[PDB]
Amino acid sequence: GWAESLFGLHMGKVALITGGSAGIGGQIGRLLALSGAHVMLAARNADQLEQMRASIVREVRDASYPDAESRVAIFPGSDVSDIDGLERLVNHTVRVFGKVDYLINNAGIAGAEEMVIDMPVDAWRHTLRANLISNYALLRRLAPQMKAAGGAYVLNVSSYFGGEKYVAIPYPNRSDYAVSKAGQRAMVESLARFLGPEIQINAIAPGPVEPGLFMRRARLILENKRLNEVFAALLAARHEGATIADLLPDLFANDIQSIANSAAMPAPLRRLATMLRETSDAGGSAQSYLMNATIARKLLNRLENGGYITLHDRRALTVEPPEPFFTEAQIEREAIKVRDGILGMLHLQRMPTEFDVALATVFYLADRNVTGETFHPSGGLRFERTVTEGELFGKPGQQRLERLKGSVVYLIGEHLRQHLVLLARTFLDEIHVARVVLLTETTQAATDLAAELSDYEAAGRFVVIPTCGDIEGGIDRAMAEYGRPGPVISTPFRPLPDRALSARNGDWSSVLTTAEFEELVEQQITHHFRVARKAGLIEGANVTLVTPPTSARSTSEEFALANFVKTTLHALTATAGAESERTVPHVPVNQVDLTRRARSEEPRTPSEEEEELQRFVNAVLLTSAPLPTPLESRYRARIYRGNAITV
Ligand SMILES: NC(=O)c1ccc[n+]([C@@H]2O[C@H](COP(=O)([O-])OP(=O)(O)OC[C@H]3O[C@@H](n4cnc5c(N)ncnc54)[C@H](OP(=O)(O)O)[C@@H]3O)[C@@H](O)[C@H]2O)c1
């Protein structure tokens, strides 16, 4: 009798639920209605919203709630990636019910389902708006009335793949999804003290809930596998002297037996084509044609963005292969492996239903003494890999640093002048690099830093390049003339916002706006994703992403935003790291944080700030010097990627 136990549990609350016409959000909306709450459901398709509303209202009357027809409302055409539309959703909800007590940030899309090195930047941005920026947007508009009335709750529906406190969990090929789920948890952790005690804010993070989905995902896996084998062989041939752009006409002949027996093909490509013709299912054209159209366009994108070829070297496929490319048998073999992976994660060997998760969640929502937590209503999972955030302990080995002699360094930054200059001086004077290229945002910063190091600049050992925000272009320019990188160190162009996070009394003009939160995600998360996207394609690069310090004022709000940035970015660094471990060119990714775990640990004297800068140098070095590949150490290649090191 679960309905009987729900009765009156949330009597008189008004809940807004996004993505509320099916799945978990439909069940939470259903069970909140069955607990006496007025619910507004929001999704895109209006008829589904109508059918779910019908079903719920019927149950509400059977439960003997008064005037059941007026207890459920719908609001169609609500795409949570459309941040400006959420305002009309809220306006309508306050208009219909008078107030919002519960905000259930439930809607969540799957994202791009590509590796970091393949992800279109605007697909990344779209996932983050839908899964992450939507949640602050709704919270920020509702928080004033919620603070006023005081019985209020924000619930972000996150995931185990958004990690846990101080721990990131890599989700290969899903970095956008993982970053938005981590960011939902991070928002809960970072805001709870400012929104309390009137607003509780928590996340839930269910485990897995119950052509099919494993079929689409299996197909992507087979396509990715083929694309990686070709990219790898292309690099191994370019390694032996081949010019990649000149192999493209013959390669895009697409015939596997042609490529395998061409003397005009470098040996790597021939060994790959031989294996393919011998292993791939013969009932598919994949055994006779190298690539389909998707593989081809992505292969060219990896080569153009990695700087291996130019726009003029782009070729269409001579012959688009005939379906079926991958046979149904291959796709099923791989989908069963996907499914078994997921199922084997689970300690209980069974999955919850959407109703189960909803039920536990709706009970959880009745507890009034918990905030800033991540509740698992479904749970019990063993993960392939977890990465704890940590603190720098030790120094890099001399041998590894010597391997940096003569390399080219790319620095990306703007406002952290002292850090950038110290990095450059260290790389040139003590590491003996060939040269340091600095990519700034504004021209002025380029000129000032070129001045403070005018000596190295005259000698050609320091270069500056103002990007005016065009990160991809600067890396292409630098690669074109100033040398191909080893160490790449991305720092943020912009500082953290100096904004409040909660009201002083009933004044909210000073609290971080939705647009400002959007800018924060752009400049402290997407900025580094753009760097990692390009540099992950560069054979022989190392990537380090640096999260910003606080200002001298060092306000609690600023500290909260820094920890938000650190937690959210780590999901990217860990997923990029796990991807590197599996796919050539195995470019490592690691993260360095300039804000400490606890606020009392921040430097308070100039001597302590000197200790920090020294440590910062040592961590950037520890992650910049050549790291072990999977071939040298299977263990060390795993653990020396995906870290977040506080200094
Ligand atoms: N294995 C799991 O299912 C699992 C586990 C952990 C976490 N989660 C999280 O749980 C949440 C819901 O998962 P689910 O499996 O129930 O999702 P789902 O199957 O995609 O649920 C679909 C619901 O969301 C709506 N929706 C879809 N795209 C939308 C968009 N762009 N804007 C607004 N509404 C949209 C749909 O209506 P329309 O399509 O008509 O708009 C419908 O109401 C997500 O945040 C997800 O990350 C799920």
Author numbering: 573 to 782, 793 to 1229
Authors' text:
Malonyl-CoA reductase (MCR) is a NADPH-dependent bi-functional enzyme that performs alcohol dehydrogenase and aldehyde dehydrogenase (CoA-acylating) activities in the N- and C-terminal fragments, respectively. It catalyzes the two-step reduction of malonyl-CoA to 3-hydroxypropionate (3-HP), a key reaction in the autotrophic CO2 fixation cycles of Chloroflexaceae green non-sulfur bacteria and the archaea Crenarchaeota. In contrast, green non-sulfur bacteria, including members of the genera Chloroflexus and Roseiflexus, employ a single bi-functional MCR to catalyze both reduction reactions of malonyl-CoA. Full-length RfxMCR was a homodimer of two cross-interlocked subunits, each containing four tandemly arranged short-chain dehydrogenase/reductase (SDR) domains.
The crystal structure of RfxMCR-C in complex with NADP+–MSA was also determined by the molecular replacement method and reﬁned to an Rwork of 22.05% and an Rfree of 25.28% at 2.3 Å resolution. The overall structure contained 28 α-helixes and 13 β-strands that were organized into tandemly arranged SDR3 (Gly573–Glu782 and Met933–Gly962), ED (Leu783–Thr932), and SDR4 (Phe963–Val1229) domains. Similar to RfxMCR-N, a cofactor NADP+ and intermediate MSA were resolved at the interface between the SDR3 and ED domains. In the substrate-binding pocket, MSA was immobilized by hydrogen bonding interactions with Ser731 (3.0 Å) and Tyr749 (3.2 Å) from the SDR3 domain and Arg799 (3.5 Å) from the ED. NADP+ was coordinated in the cofactor-binding pocket through extensive hydrogen bonding interactions with Tyr749 (2.6 Å), Lys753 (3.1 Å), Ser593 (2.7 Å), Arg616 (2.9 Å), and Asp651 (3.2 Å). Mutation of the NADP+–MSA coordinating residues Ser731, Tyr749, Lys753, and Arg799 completely eliminated enzymatic activity. When NADP+–MSA was bound, members of the SDR3 catalytic triad (Ser731–Lys753–Tyr749) were shifted toward the substrate-binding pocket to form hydrogen bonds with NADP+ and MSA. Specifically, the guanidine side chain of Arg799 was flipped by ~1.6 Å to stabilize the MSA carbonyl group, and the side chains of Asp651 and Arg616 were shifted by ~2.0 Å and 4.1 Å, respectively, to immobilize the adenosine ring of NADP+; this further resulted in partial closure of the adenosine ring–binding site in NADP+–MSA-bound RfxMCR-C. As indicated in the structural analyses of NADP+–MSA-bound RfxMCR-C, the reaction intermediate MSA could be further stabilized in a proton relay network by hydrogen bonding interactions with Ser731, Tyr749, and Arg799 for the second reduction step.
